[PDB]
Design a protein around this nucleic acid. Structure first.
Ligand SMILES: *C(=O)c1cnc2ccccc2n1
Ligand SMILES: *C(=O)c1cnc2ccccc2n1
Ligand SMILES: *C(=O)c1cnc2ccccc2n1
Ligand SMILES: *C(=O)c1cnc2ccccc2n1
Ligand SMILES: [K+]
Ligand SMILES: [Mn+2]
Ligand SMILES: [Mn+2]
Lengths: 8, 8
DNA sequence: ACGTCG
DNA sequence: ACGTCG
């Protein structure tokens, strides 16, 4: 849920 | 993830 | 259940 | 020369 590299 | 030159 | 740049 | 999460 975090999106720092993916944002899922 | 680190931004030391890109910051992704 | 998700992976990234100069 | 450096790693970023709910
Ligand atoms: C987002 O909150 C979150 C938490 N755990 C994960 C595990 C695997 C893929 C994506 C996820 N996203
Ligand atoms: C994004 O591509 C990415 C990959 N690995 C991680 C590990 C821990 C926190 C955040 C991350 N983000
Ligand atoms: C950030 O933590 C991080 C780690 N590895 C990477 C590889 C390629 C592009 C960006 C990256 N960012
Ligand atoms: C920033 O543009 C950049 C390019 N190469 C690196 C190599 C190692 C650590 C940090 C770096 N930052
Ligand atoms: K982001
Ligand atoms: Mn991964
Ligand atoms: Mn690394």
């Amino acid at each position: 849920x975090a999106x720092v590299x993916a944002x899922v």
